[PDB]
Amino acid sequence: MERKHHFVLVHNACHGAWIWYKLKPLLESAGHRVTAVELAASGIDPRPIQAVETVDEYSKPLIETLKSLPENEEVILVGFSFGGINIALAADIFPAKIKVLVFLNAFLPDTTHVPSHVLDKLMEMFGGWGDTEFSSHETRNGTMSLLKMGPKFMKARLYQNCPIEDYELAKMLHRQGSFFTEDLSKKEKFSEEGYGSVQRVYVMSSEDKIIPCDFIRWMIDNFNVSKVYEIDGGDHMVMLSKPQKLFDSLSAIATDYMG
Template sequence: MGNYMACMGSKQKKKNSKLNMSGMRRRGPLEDELIEKQALAMALHQQHKAQLRFERSLSHRDPATAPPRRSYSGKPSSGKLEYTRSASTRPRHSNDLLIDPQQLLNGTREGFLAATLESKHFVLVHGGGLGAWCWYKSIALLEESGFVATAVDLAGSGIEPTDPNQITSLAQYVKPLVEILENLAGTEKVILVGHNIGGGCISYVMECFPNRIAKAIFVAASMVCTGQRAFDVFAKQEKGEEDLMPKAQKFIYGNGNASTPTAVELDKSLVRDLFFNASPAKDIALATVSMRPIPFAPAMEKITLTPENYGRVRRFFIETTDDQALSPAAQQNIITQNPPQQVFSLKGSDHSPFFSKPQSLHKIFLEIAQLEAKE
């Protein structure tokens, strides 16, 4: 209950202070070299003429014990589409879906969004060591589809200036996210997305602001139960000789070696295989120069969640099947212990689908956004 009371106190702050939101908003795809554009145009023209179809393959699960699961493999399905390019300049994997970002499943961009969506504002929360920058492809795709996309830098992350070693609580770590929710206009709600230990962060604010969150999406994330820590789901997965996570972690002792670690740094020589094993080289380079140490205390803090607050928000989980940081078995344990409303599976995705499968991830975002409001 402690974190809930802390949030309630925070909500009494003056609303006329300027929003110190270290988020990131970018719009539009990146420009590419002329020769790449010509080659892409030829390939997309051939796809258009063939009227490629996208098929959804449904994972086999026991419906009595598990939430429904949708699997996005990138196979063709019916429907005539006009394709656009994602922000990545790397040749696209054949199983990363190509979609028109303005095309929604059940209506036009203008009419459908305005008329029936419970929320058209996505708030994107990064995982440990990352920042708002990691969502740049998702931001572009969402905005081109008519949504509002806000990516936040948690304290000590991205360009937020706090020293990660000086962050001593989860409340301090998620303060930039809390400020976004506190400053929403009127009765506005958001669709909250969390990745990695960002799942613990969005769980924390779901408890504090259930009336401000329409849906919560956990992308290979810590979807904790009450009393758990965000780091627990990573610590509890089975360790083998080839497991990279313990090898990649370097603890920082900002208060001396005799005290508790203050932050965790990831070995950049191993992070490619750990987080980005299916991602484009340019995105890996961006991550290598942008990642920062992860504050230790927030990930180790137990989170109190209640059915009355956290339990009111509909939850969705997105699996990443080629994940080297959070194994498919560990993700299944998360789902079994704390079942969400629905599970989606991204085939061929590493731990960072916003890099490796941006179009497929975006399609799932659109589908979740279009689910009707809970009565």
């Protein structure tokens, strides 16, 4: 039998581990191991976002998950949306624990510009946020920009190809979050020796209404990847709209990083 892999899955801002509830059993039925991280103030994490004042604090449960792996184990690290930023922060700390980073409908940062750069670029040309609620929270680290998605924005821009049940679930579970853009704009740039050394692929949905295909090509042109996979018909929440096709993409990646 083909050697199986351990996938570590990292969710998007304002969501939680729960988003992987369709994908996780598909991977485990194929014989792979899956860890679905719950970031700080996400899902059922007990902290409010107001208590998590920096991106490193946000990302700590992922760093802990990697720190805790047995010696010499390497994972397939999948980051979704803002999850791309978290996996890049993880790869600058534990590069040798990661076989390949998988940027799934994700922010793909570089090692030349400040770590906020690709978010700043998107926020400039984002289109509408709809009924999304923006608020500020003042901290010792400076002012944190918070957001709470609105349900019309969710339906139109994130979940438009998802079953109604998944949209209802999402309504029931999403939380106020942050993209930590202030904090990312002050952080030291991601390193070529850490992050930049790790193998990376991109998986894009063809109907992502949040992270459009032109912006993705821009990111990749600033920071190349070894291969691009496309999921036809996926919305942004591709693990909910097209879990099987996502499985297929992940499987194809895993067959490339046998070794």
